[PDB]
């Protein structure tokens, strides 16, 4: 094993030279650890990722930290293996970066902890699972309009609307309470304040003791945001293939992953394409998302909020992710145009779980009734806009009667951030919520004020709060 030399630097892209014979392969982890020779120099500690072979015994790499301080002629140490992250019952509760260094600040991982490669091919078709298990999320809207397939993949792609972060934060707590399985939350480009708030919330709640997270500072060079989420996937892979206990995973964003990769891929890349994006965006994203799949041994279920620039879904970067999600909540404005939040589009959001033979038709009948009563408003809203008088030239009668009032009964209050709004709330299962659904569809409480069906927990809560609120 010999050493290498640095030749040229452009932005975060850094070139490395090597002798013949000991040339490292692609995706190998290259590490630089020098010291200052004299006063005109500054100490540097940084690691690199191999991308290309340009011939002439040269290799083009990228960085994982700030490149300020790199000087031509440095000695480059080759490890020979891809970046490796500790796995096992050592990582439960810690806070890791892209390299695997625990910034949790309690201590440093032992040098012989089981370290596994980040990059490897996804599991093959030979054994992929097919069972459809439904998860009771405990939120009426997600359980009704498009219930989540526990084991597949769920994606709150919201078209980059405001109102996702809070939803993921609430889902963490309530789903973890539902099933105390292993949980992992990874952020590919983070509002550092939001990341710290989530860490403090988890530590206060106590669920941090049975979870593990990796945070990518959005100020880090695009190498970290390109290769961060694979750390969470690797840890989930370990916890699935080592103990069989079913694991649940979160992703804060994927579009920022694509963008951060795209910038470097175009800087050193062959040529641009699309709207200035990568040439290999589809393959890069497919190799990542295709690893999150339920298997014969165990199941991985993930929640990924997706950013969509300018609220235009024709963007290829999210447009290519649709095939990788089995339950899509197209939030868009998510009724932030109305006072309502964070409701998911009541008709556009779709999933695989909408089937009488998958959910049991006892819920499908109620889903039918709710769909029919609530879809007709916007279907005739553009007409009632002009015909907004007291006239009845339109047979929109019961739709105007119900639509807004029952849309108001599409928001939960049990564990909201009272620091952000202040309202209390109580938990609700869909099993007992179907009773309130049948009651509202048959119209027992059509005489109650519309403001009394808004921001409420359960049907008994609605009726009692309505009776108390201005009778």
């Amino acid at each position: 094993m010999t050493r290498g030399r640095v030749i040229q630097v452009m932005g975060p892209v850094v070139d490395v030279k090597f002798e013949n014979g000991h040339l490292p392969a692609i995706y190998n982890a290259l590490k630089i650890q020098h010291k200052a020779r004299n006063e005109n120099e500054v100490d540097i500690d940084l690691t690199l990722e191999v991308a290309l072979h340009l011939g002439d015994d040269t290799v083009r790499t990228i960085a994982m930290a700030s490149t300020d301080g790199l000087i031509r002629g440095m000695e480059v140490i080759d490890t020979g293996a891809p970046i490796s992250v500790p796995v096992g019952e050592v990582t439960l509760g810690r806070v890791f970066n892209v390299l695997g260094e625990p910034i949790d600040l309690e201590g440093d991982i032992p040098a012989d902890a089981r370290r596994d490669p980040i990059h490897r091919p996804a599991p093959k078709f030979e054994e992929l699972a097919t069972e459809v298990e439904i998860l009771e999320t405990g939120i009426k809207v997600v359980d009704l309009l498009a219930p989540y397939i526990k084991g597949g993949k769920i994606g709150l792609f919201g078209g980059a609307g405001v109102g996702k972060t809070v939803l993921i934060q609430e889902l963490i707590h309530n789903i973890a309470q539902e099933h105390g399985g292993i949980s992992v939350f990874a952020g590919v480009g983070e509002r550092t304040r939001e990341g710290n708030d989530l860490y403090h919330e988890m530590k206060d709640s106590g669920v941090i003791s049975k979870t593990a997270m990796v945070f990518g500072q959005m100020n880090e060079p695009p190498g970290a945001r390109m290769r961060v989420a694979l750390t969470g996937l690797t840890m989930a892979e370990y916890f699935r293939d080592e103990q069989g206990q079913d694991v649940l995973l979160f992703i804060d964003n994927i579009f920022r992953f694509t963008q951060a990769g795209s910038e470097v891929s175009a800087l050193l890349g062959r040529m641009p394409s699309a709207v200035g994006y990568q040439p290999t965006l589809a393959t890069e994203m497919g190799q990542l998302q295709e690893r999150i799949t339920s298997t014969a041994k165990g199941s991985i279920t993930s929640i990924q909020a997706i950013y969509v620039p300018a609220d235009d879904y024709t963007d290829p970067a999210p447009a290519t992710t649709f095939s990788h999600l089995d339950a899509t909540t197209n939030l868009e404005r998510k009724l932030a145009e109305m006072g309502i939040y964070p409701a998911v589009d009541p008709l556009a959001s779709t999933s695989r779980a909408l089937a009488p033979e998958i959910v049991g038709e006892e819920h499908y009948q109620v889903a039918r009734k709710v769909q029919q009563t609530l879809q007709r408003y916007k279907e005739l809203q553009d007409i009632i806009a002009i015909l907004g008088m007291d006239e009845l030239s339109d047979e929109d009668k019961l739709v105007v009667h119900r639509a807004r009032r029952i849309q108001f009964f599409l928001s939960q209050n049990f564990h909201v951030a009272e620091q952000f709004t202040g309202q209390p709330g109580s938990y609700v299962p869909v099993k007992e919520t179907v009773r309130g659904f049948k009651e509202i569809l048959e119209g027992k409480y059509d005489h109650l004020p519309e403001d009394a069906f808004r921001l409420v927990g359960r049907i008994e809560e609605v009726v009692e709060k309505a009776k108390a609120m201005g009778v």
Partner: protein
Amino acid sequence: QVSDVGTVIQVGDGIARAHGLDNVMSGELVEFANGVMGMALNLEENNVGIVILGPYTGIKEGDEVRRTGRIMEVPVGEALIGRVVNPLGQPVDGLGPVETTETRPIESPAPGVMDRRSVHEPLQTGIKAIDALVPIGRGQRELIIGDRQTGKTSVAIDTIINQKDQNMISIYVAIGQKESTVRTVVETLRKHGALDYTIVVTASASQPAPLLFLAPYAGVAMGEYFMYKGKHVLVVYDDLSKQAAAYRELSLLLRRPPGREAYPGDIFYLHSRLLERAAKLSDAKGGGSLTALPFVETQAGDISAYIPTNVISITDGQIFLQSDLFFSGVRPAINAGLSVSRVGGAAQIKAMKKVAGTLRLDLAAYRELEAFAQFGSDLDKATQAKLARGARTVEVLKQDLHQPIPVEKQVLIIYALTRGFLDDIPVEDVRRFEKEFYLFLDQNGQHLLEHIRTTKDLPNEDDLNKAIEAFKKTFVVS
């Protein structure tokens, strides 16, 4: 003496290509044997692509550069208070050069994630609309965008001026601002008396693109030293669009590949470094705090553009100004519909949290119903009361230029019943009503607002219901 001396080959467009420098370290400062500065950015295989800081007329071929090994630094210190300086530190208004010797690297690591806190300290902007509807903490990163001459600079001026009774230091960074306009702003600041704390850094149009690029970094670097001291620092930008334009020009000159709409790839990794060096520091690093108000220009509020799309995803809150509303009579044209704030509630006092929790709902409902009733013929009169109340409460959310209204006087006017008292002639009463009410409180009921100042929460409403009744009786109807 030991050094590594280069050789200048190509000169043009404020760019110099140097060959040699076996000991060249990326990002260092270098001089061109003519008293001018320079920076090294593109360390190609056999030549160094140096970027010229300042005038480049005197440079030709054959000149030799001298290494310095100095990471690009800017002086900081307490003597900068009240100074207007070039991003290198030298003042532009004479007054003798800078005095403090403490320096910091322009490119420095950002504060760690474990060292921050849930920002729970309000900021007293003093403008009614932004105060009530879009709160600002002491470490938040609010974004302000809009069209030309929609009042963004006026919002910045009001925000910086209102800091007259707090522990805040305000840092102004005018990127691309015309020099005469910068002089006018300095004169207004001196006329209002805010130079006792303000550090203003200016970079004219005539200045080179490298300086226009490095100016915001110099401002934030100056802010960071006061941050670690334990103070609170406010940093206000200008024309990050022009900052991005300068960086795009530099990247195109250095022959880097261009991305979409000619902007280089690392624009986002640049803006993230620019913005994410502001937060709240816990006691573990000193109880400091720093908030920033980057500004972005746009055409008619069109947010489809690449730079606004890159910026809005970073900032914790976006403030929209529209000339459409501004010419309509809403002089502080804060578009309350599309303006959000990810620190809502926790950035408002225990009184504003009580009173303003319904005003945004009322305004949204007013716009919701008036969208249906953009024409007022044969309307359903049952819902018209809320339309009237929204119309007569939106009138409250505006104030004239150079008028910072204190939160204590503001909370009474935006009280959840003050949005719903008499309003006998609301189309014209309320404007003089609020001024005569402030005078009435300051001459008769100063104790009422003294309680608000001392408590940060509402007193018993009857104790102020009496004052409201007395003011209604005394005030002359219109």
